[PDB]
């Protein structure tokens, strides 16, 4: 069919790979697979080693430092290739067998394995002013020829191709995302009831949000404005639990409701990248070199998973926030507001 080839700049170390884009399920991991073809006449005694380093880039997009490099890798697995692992008999795959049959016995294969508790390949938005290596988590597969792990990797004889790990939709969804929060003011003990609902929980990217609001304003106050906005929650977990609250698409409507009156009509929202070009700190799903992609697919995890170990976790929650008026015997136009959370997993389907 088709197999990707990268090859060394020198023209000696060539790495094959089945699928650049790799899926990940809740409790099952798609394994990477590939073979390495190199001229043994060149490799007199040097051993070819192939690794997978899940880089986390966080420092700007400028040049590196003498010793800092502002990087860390959450998982580095190295597997020997020369000789073809005589100690351990790896479970050779159908793809690996076909690849070794296409070429001769010169090539030697390799195989990795990814623990499920690892972040999906997401790169944060570089921004307009930045020009360089992007932020976020970026997978990598590199094969080098050397004699020891501690030895320097000769870049002039080093091959590197970027893979991406991306999660795909759950075919069976839950019932619905619903939440209803009321608020009682100090002036009167007649709180108003707010209800919000969505069409489904999993949304294919670009599909329209269908928020269904329902307010029963029983208090002696008026709702000035209604704000609906899907907010990207990019829970960066490096050694902390830092959280971001970048909005993606906010639609407003001055549909005021009189006191002691109800109001229920559905709104439509669509999250897209065309008008979010300048929003620095946004999370985007995957980048090979610079090709524009969609927004960050919601990285679902298995129920009860250790959610305090991963690299970057993004999730999408829509806010139904409406602003009220502080009119009365002694009050100004400025007042507070009541908002309700609603989570939904907007992320790709499976072909």
């Amino acid at each position, epitope marked *: 069919t*088709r197999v990707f080839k990268k090859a060394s700049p020198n023209g000696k170390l060539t790495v094959y790979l089945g699928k650049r884009d790799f899926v990940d399920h809740i409790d099952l991991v798609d394994p990477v697979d590939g073979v390495v073809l190199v001229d043994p006449e060149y490799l007199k005694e040097r051993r070819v080693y192939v690794t997978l380093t899940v880089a986390f880039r966080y420092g700007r997009e400028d040049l590196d430092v003498l010793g800092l490099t502002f990087r860390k890798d959450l998982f580095v697995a190295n597997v020997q290739s020369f000789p073809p692992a005589p100690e351990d008999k790896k479970p050779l795959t159908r793809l690996q067998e076909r690849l070794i049959k296409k070429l001769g016995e010169h090539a030697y294969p390799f195989t990795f394995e990814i623990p499920p508790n690892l972040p999906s390949s997401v790169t944060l938005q570089p921004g307009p002013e930045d020009t360089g290596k992007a932020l976020g988590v970026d997978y990598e597969v590199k094969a080098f020829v050397a004699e020891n792990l501690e030895e320097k990797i000769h870049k002039r004889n080093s091959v590197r191709l970027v893979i991406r790990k991306v999660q795909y939709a759950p075919e069976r969804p839950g019932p619905q995302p619903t939440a209803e929060t009321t608020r009682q003011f100090l002036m009167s003990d007649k709180p108003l009831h707010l209800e919000a609902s969505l069409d489904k929980e999993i949304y294919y990217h670009g599909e329209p949000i269908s928020v269904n609001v329902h307010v029963t304003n029983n208090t002696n106050k008026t709702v000035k404005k209604i704000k609906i906005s899907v907010r990207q929650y990019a829970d960066i977990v490096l050694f902390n639990t830092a959280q971001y609250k970048v909005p993606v698409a906010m639609e407003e409507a001055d549909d005021t409701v009189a006191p002691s009156s109800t109001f229920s009509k559905v709104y439509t929202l669509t999250p897209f*990248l065309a008008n979010n070009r300048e929003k620095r700190g946004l999370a985007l799903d995957g980048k090979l070199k610079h090709e524009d992609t969609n927004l960050a697919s919601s990285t679902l995890l298995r129920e009860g998973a250790n959610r305090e170990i991963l690299g970057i976790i993004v999730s999408y929650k829509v806010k139904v926030k409406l602003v009220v008026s502080r009119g009365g015997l002694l009050g100004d136009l400025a007042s507070s507001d009541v908002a309700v959370e609603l989570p939904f997993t907007l992320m790709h389907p499976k072909p």
Partner: single-chain antibody
Amino acid sequence: VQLVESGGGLVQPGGSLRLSCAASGFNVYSSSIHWVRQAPGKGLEWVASISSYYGYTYYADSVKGRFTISADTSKNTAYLQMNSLRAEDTAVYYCARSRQFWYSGLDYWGQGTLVTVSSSDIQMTQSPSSLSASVGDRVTITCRASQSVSSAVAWYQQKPGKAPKLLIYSASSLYSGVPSRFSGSRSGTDFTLTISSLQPEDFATYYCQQYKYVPVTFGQGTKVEIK
């Protein structure tokens, strides 16, 4: 699930026309509405495309700086302004929809509007130019690409009058809705699909598309007749 086309007519040279196509059931933020031109008695050629999710606007060599294409998400409609029409712009325009994520050929098309005027670049090559065959004759049409695309090609069976439909994409999988007899294969830069059981309905002109680089363009064109 379908897209309509409107705005046809006859415009003198130097005129303008804001021909527009409207689609229902296709989210504009999930589908990149395309725009193609079939010359009178010649081959179809892509002219413009807008991918509303990204806010981009790609053109072609004869299209860049000539006409303007825009769309709005409110009416789910795309309006193509054919400003500064010339003699070479005389063609029929079909409004086509493709999945704006992971391009998979042109799924849905439109009726089309005929436009007439009165008072780097790569080119796929399709062979044979013409052919006449009967029922049960194994026929293969080869689309040879000058520059090797990454296994991402599509084939369209355009009957006379009606808009072309999609049968294959990436030369491997057939679109849901076509009979299983259709197939396809990749051989280097040469792309070939097989038509053996030539039914009376399947006898129509075939066209090869390569959706790899910008200025996406069709090939040369083939025809299927009865021997």
